[PDB]
């Protein structure tokens, strides 16, 4: 069945570029097969020899070919998983049954805990989505075709028409330029994020809640999940996160907020007419009777011809139609208003004619529900009306609440300008104590601070104008104000002051972001110091949110040390919040790759310390993970399934708390790990030199994924990207070798204690299992090839030292997990792209192959390329395809 895609695609490839090129692709496939089988490193050079001969256009076509074959492999894998799972006729029903049987927990406990449980998924425009959207659509169509084929209800002509359809959709994908020729704007990123709503999420949320209802009825709970119960929520960073991204201007934030609002208004408006058609009963309460009579009083006996259906005054015979007709009116005016507000700078549509409240909208629908229940129509109410209720109470008037993020130093620049212009000193030079006292006096005082005439920089005006934009817009359109590089209470209070002073009517919550290891180590002390300020603790209203980054922690220190310190951080932050009687909700800035704290979602949730969630969780979804977890109905369902099940279990089934011997052991082990890590990534003076040569790191910016224009000073995303492309995964496994070897060295019974830890402590089991997965996706022969082709003859043994540690570390990992179904194959295509990337990198870093209308062939697609005509496109294609095969970019 693996042969199928190969057959169809290679048929199309021959129909588009001839037999010769299809045969050469087949040869590369056979050599790669002999490599992923026999594992002879000579086969790699044997393959590269074939790659050298290729014409400039032909090499582009070859990279294209293995790239699209990898994408098709991803789609076939998704289809086979969905069907192999569906033909069974963690998991929600299994989780409930286990919670009853294992832990003696009762159904009403599960229902109660589930009612008060919340999972806030926030989508980010982090530049990790390699495939352009124009091609993502084509992928969606193709997986639709392959899903309809993998079935036994095919009627011959339907199968033939799906054959023609899949053929033309493959041809369409292959006929599009996969290379973004200009990087996107923030608005484009927000569009790409929000596209999953009016395609999957919007109908996916009600379906998921309905399934939860079914499971609860399978436990004996006739009651239903409350429509207003916030089991899942969505936030966004698209257009809000401006940290290190000057292209996210205030006007961008206005744009994305008006945008999302208009999308919501449109969706509700498309729903409301069909809901009106269904609610055709004539029985209601005295309550709904009175209200419908009220609407029929001010019924506006008019033509009302702007609508298509129900343009006549709705008779009181059908009262639900009266009320929902008013809901339609306020929806029409909401949509037209947001459309004008976005299109122009203003609208003449009266605000009293629109829905301004989150639940001005909800009130009429709530009334319809109470009516249906009172009159015995609870089944009818638990249908389209319940779907609509959940959609309103989940997506609100603006599909997602937007977060704003900014680095603390910009707020410090603003405040410094304010104190200098006020001739009272320099806020920068002030100590922490002084800043706290001053900020407190201004927060409690009633006199305005700065004025119209405050001297501002483009930066200072940028942040001040973002606050004014926040003031101008509706409060339910925003989420949290996240402070990057937060260290002291003064950083938070500076934001509270700048908000109040910029006349922010309803100021949004402030949340510090601790991402570097130094800041996570001292985070509990800082949060406690903030809670110590009574003025802030009284306004925080017993609830506080603090963000915990995962990307940069494992970059400057070891991955093991970073994970362990993260656990410690969560644990002591919970201790602080409990100490101050504040409900702490922690915001996990997790990535897609394990190097940035990624991995299976339920494993990451299980690896959190116990009693740190408590029915309140907040997790980012990094760009590419949006597509990974919401591009199909089944994917979206399995996602919300995984999240809510993991949280509920972590609430009722606490993970084991570590024994003290395991605490001290992991402290020592973390010391050894960090020394081992910084030994090779910072102490070695030639390391940065070897890195910029042996990995394709420098070329990452050429993909134009995001809108954002030494090794300590680079972003974590291309850091994990470089070692993932070369399939070496250094930042994933580095410290573990020396850590384990030192722990068995110091004591031999520590081997028995490691074996003890792997079989009982969830955090350790997950950590080791993840490292084992990453080893299952690695091959040091690739890094050897990159060294032999790109690293100077001098520090060749350096990489071999690394290659040593790799295997050494792997030997230890399986020794702790106690290890020693036949997918493979895709590594053949991946290998071909690896060799192509190495040799292409060699030809790129040369002088001979450098630079000193319409397009009708692939070579004319890059006319402004500093490198040789056909080369740059080939390199970008290699990165794209290798990323697709590994199902991870950075």
Contact residues for a second copy, defined by CB under 8 A: 16, 86, 89, 93, 134-135, 137-138, 153-157, 160-161, 164-165, 167-169, 171-172, 175-177, 181, 185, 187-188, 191, 210-211, 214-215, 255, 259, 262-263, 277-278, 280-283, 289, 305-306, 308-309, 311-312, 315, 317, 339, 342-343, 376-377, 379-380, 382-383, 854-856, 861
Q: Residue 334 CB, nearest distance to a second copy (Å)?
A: 16
Q: Residue 318 CB, nearest distance to a second copy (Å)?
A: 8
Residue matched to tokens 């599960």: 110
- 157/153 Cα distance (integer angstroms): 12
The nearer residue to a second copy, 177 or 772, going by C-beta atoms, is 177
Nearest Cα residue to 392 out of 354, 366, 374, 353: 366
The nearer residue to a second copy, 38 or 853, going by C-beta atoms, is 853
Q: Residue 80 CB, nearest distance to a second copy (Å)?
A: 16
Q: Residue 27 CB, nearest distance to a second copy (Å)?
A: 25
Let me know: does 99 contact 91? Beta carbons within 8 Å.
Answer: no
Nearest Cα residue to 239 out of 230, 231, 250, 228: 250
Active site residue 555: yes
Q: Residue 640 CB, nearest distance to a second copy (Å)?
A: 15
Q: Name the active-site residue from 126, 568, 602, 650.
A: 126
Q: Give the phi and the psi of residue 619 in degrees, each rounded to 5.
A: -135, 140
Nearest Cα residue to 445 out of 497, 491, 510: 497
Q: Residue 44 CB, nearest distance to a second copy (Å)?
A: 34
The DSSP result for 230-250, as a single string, is: -SEEEEE-TTTB-TT-TTS-H
The nearer residue to a second copy, 236 or 593, going by C-beta atoms, is 236
- Indicate the SS3 state at residue 727: coil
**What does the buried/exposed string (b/e) look like for 252-275 if buried means 16 or more CB atoms within 10 Å of the residue's CB?**
bbbbbbbbbbbbbbbbbbebbbeb
Cα angle for residues 384, 617, 126 (degrees, 5° grid): 90
- 743/739 Cα distance (integer angstroms): 6
Sign of CA dihedral 852, 855, 858, 864: positive
- Alpha-carbon distances of 246 from 185, 258, 513, 628, rounded to whole Å: 11, 20, 19, 28
Active site residue 126: yes
Q: Residue 233 CB, nearest distance to a second copy (Å)?
A: 23
- 662/669 Cα distance (integer angstroms): 10
For residue 273, give both structure tokens. Answer: 């007419």
The nearer residue to a second copy, 311 or 796, going by C-beta atoms, is 311
The nearer residue to a second copy, 251 or 432, going by C-beta atoms, is 251
The nearer residue to a second copy, 281 or 582, going by C-beta atoms, is 281
Tell me the CB-side half-sphere exposure of residue 361, using CA atoms within 13 A. 27
The nearer residue to a second copy, 280 or 759, going by C-beta atoms, is 280
Q: Name the active-site residue from 64, 333, 555, 602.
A: 555
- Phi-psi region at 431: left, alpha or beta (left = phi > 0; alpha = psi -120 to 50): beta
Cα angle for residues 460, 466, 470 (degrees, 5° grid): 150
- 524/705 Cα distance (integer angstroms): 36
Q: Residue 168 CB, nearest distance to a second copy (Å)?
A: 4
The nearer residue to a second copy, 176 or 541, going by C-beta atoms, is 176
- 310/275 Cα distance (integer angstroms): 12
- Indicate the SS3 state at residue 349: coil
Q: Residue 336 CB, nearest distance to a second copy (Å)?
A: 11
The nearer residue to a second copy, 305 or 749, going by C-beta atoms, is 305
- Alpha-carbon distances of 826 from 2, 58, 66, 71, 149, rounded to whole Å: 10, 22, 10, 10, 22
Sign of CA dihedral 24, 28, 29, 34: positive
The nearer residue to a second copy, 330 or 634, going by C-beta atoms, is 634
Nearest Cα residue to 114 out of 640, 766, 639: 640
Q: Residue 788 CB, nearest distance to a second copy (Å)?
A: 37
Residues assigned a catalytic role: 126, 555
């Amino acid at each position: 069945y693996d042969a199928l895609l190969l057959d169809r695609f290679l048929d199309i490839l021959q129909d588009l570029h001839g037999e010769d090129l299809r045969e050469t692709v087949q040869e590369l496939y056979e050599h790669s097969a002999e490599y992923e089988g026999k594992h002879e490193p000579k086969k790699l050079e044997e393959l590269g020899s074939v790659l050298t001969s290729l014409d400039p256009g032909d090499s582009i076509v070859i990279a294209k070919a293995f790239s699209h074959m990898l994408n098709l492999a991803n789609l076939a894998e998704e289809v086979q998983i969905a069907y192999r799972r569906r033909i069974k006729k963690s998991d929600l029903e299994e989780t409930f049954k286990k919670l009853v049987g294992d832990l003696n927990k009762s159904p009403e406990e599960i229902f109660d805990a589930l009612k008060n449980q919340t999972v806030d998924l926030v989508l980010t425009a982090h530049p990790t989505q390699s495939v352009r959207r124009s091609l993502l659509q084509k992928h969606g169509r193709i997986r639709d075709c392959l899903a309809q084929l993998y079935a036994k209800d095919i009627t011959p002509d339907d199968k033939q028409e799906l054959d023609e359809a899949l053929q033309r959709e493959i041809q369409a994908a292959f006929r599009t330029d996969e290379i973004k020729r200009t990087p996107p704007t923030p608005q484009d990123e927000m569009r790409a994020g929000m596209s999953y709503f009016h395609e999957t999420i919007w109908k996916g949320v009600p379906k998921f809640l309905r399934r939860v209802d079914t499971a609860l009825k399978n436990i004996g709970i006739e009651e239903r999940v409350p429509y207003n119960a916030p089991l899942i929520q969505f936030s966004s960073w698209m257009g809000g996160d401006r940290d290190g991204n000057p292209r996210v201007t205030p006007e961008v934030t206005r744009d994305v907020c008006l945008l999302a609002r208009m999308m919501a208004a449109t969706m509700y408006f498309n729903q409301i007419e069909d809901l009106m058609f269904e609610m055709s009963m004539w029985r209601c309460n005295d309550e709904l009777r009175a209200r419908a009579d009220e609407v029929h009083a001010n019924s506006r006996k008019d033509a009302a011809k702007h609508y298509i259906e129900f343009w006549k005054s709705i008779p009181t015979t059908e009262p639900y139609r009266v009320i929902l007709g008013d809901v339609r009116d306020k929806l029409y005016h909401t949509r037209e208003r947001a459309h004008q507000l976005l299109s122009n700078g203003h609208s003449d549509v009266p605000v009293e004619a629109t829905f301004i409240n989150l639940e001005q909208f909800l009130e009429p629908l709530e009334l319809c529900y109470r009516s249906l229940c009172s009159c015995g129509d609870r089944p009818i109410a638990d249908g389209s009306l319940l779907d609509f209720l959940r959609q309103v109470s989940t997506f609100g008037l603006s599909l997602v609440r937007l977060d704003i993020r900014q680095e603390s130093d910009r707020h410090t620049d603003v405040l410094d300008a304010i104190t200098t212009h006020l001739d009272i000193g320099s806020y920068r030079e002030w100590s922490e104590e002084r800043r706290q006292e001053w900020l407190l006096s201004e927060l409690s005082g009633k006199r305005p601070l700065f004025g119209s005439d405050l001297p501002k920089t483009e930066e200072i005006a940028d942040v001040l104008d973002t606050f004014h934009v926040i003031a101008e817009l509706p409060a339910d359109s925003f989420g949290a104000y996240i402070i990057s590089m937060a260290t002291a209470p003064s950083d938070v209070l500076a934001v509270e002051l700048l908000q109040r002073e910029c006349r922010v009517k309803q100021p949004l919550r402030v949340v510090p972001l601790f991402e570097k290891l130094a800041d996570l180590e001292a985070a509990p002390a800082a949060v406690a110091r903030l809670f110590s300020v009574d003025w802030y603790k009284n306004r925080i209203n017993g609830k506080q949110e603090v963000m915990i980054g995962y990307s940069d922690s494992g970059k400057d220190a070891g991955r093991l040390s970073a994970a362990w310190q993260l656990y410690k951080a969560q644990e002591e932050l919970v201790k602080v919040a409990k100490e101050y009687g504040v409900k702490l909700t922690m915001f996990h800035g997790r990535g897609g790759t394990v190097g940035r704290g990624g991995g299976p979602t339920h494993l990451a949730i299980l690896s959190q310390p116990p009693d740190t969630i408590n029915g309140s969780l907040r997790v980012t979804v990094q760009g590419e993970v949006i597509e990974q977890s919401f591009s199909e109905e089944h994917l979206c369902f399995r996602t919300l399934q995984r999240f809510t099940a993991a949280t509920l279990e972590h609430g009722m089934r606490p993970p084991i708390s570590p024994k003290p011997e395991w605490r001290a052991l992991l402290d020592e082990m973390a010391v050894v790990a960090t020394e081992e890590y910084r030994s090779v990534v910072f102490q070695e003076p030639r390391f940065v030199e070897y890195f910029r040569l042996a990995t394709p790191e420098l070329e990452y910016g050429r993909m134009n994924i995001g809108s954002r224009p030494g090794i300590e000073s680079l972003r974590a995303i291309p850091w994990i990207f470089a070692w993932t492309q070369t399939r070496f995964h250094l930042p994933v496994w580095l410290g573990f070798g020396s850590a384990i070897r030192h722990v068995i060295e110091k004591d031999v019974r520590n081997l028995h204690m490691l074996q003890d830890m792997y079989q009982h402590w969830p955090f350790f089991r997950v950590t080791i299992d993840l490292i084992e997965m990453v080893f299952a996706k690695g091959d040091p022969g690739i890094a050897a090839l990159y060294d032999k082709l790109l690293v100077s003859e001098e520090l060749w043994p350096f990489g071999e030292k690394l290659r040593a540690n790799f295997e050494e570390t792997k030997k230890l990992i399986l020794q702790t997990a106690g290890h020693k179904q036949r997918l493979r194959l895709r590594d053949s295509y991946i290998t071909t792209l690896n060799v192509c990337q190495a040799y292409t990198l060699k030809r790129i870093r040369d002088p001979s192959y450098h630079v000193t209308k319409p397009a009708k062939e692939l070579i004319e697609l890059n006319p402004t390329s500093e490198y040789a005509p056909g080369l740059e496109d080939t390199l970008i294609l290699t990165m794209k395809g290798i990323a697709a095969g590994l199902q991870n970019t950075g």
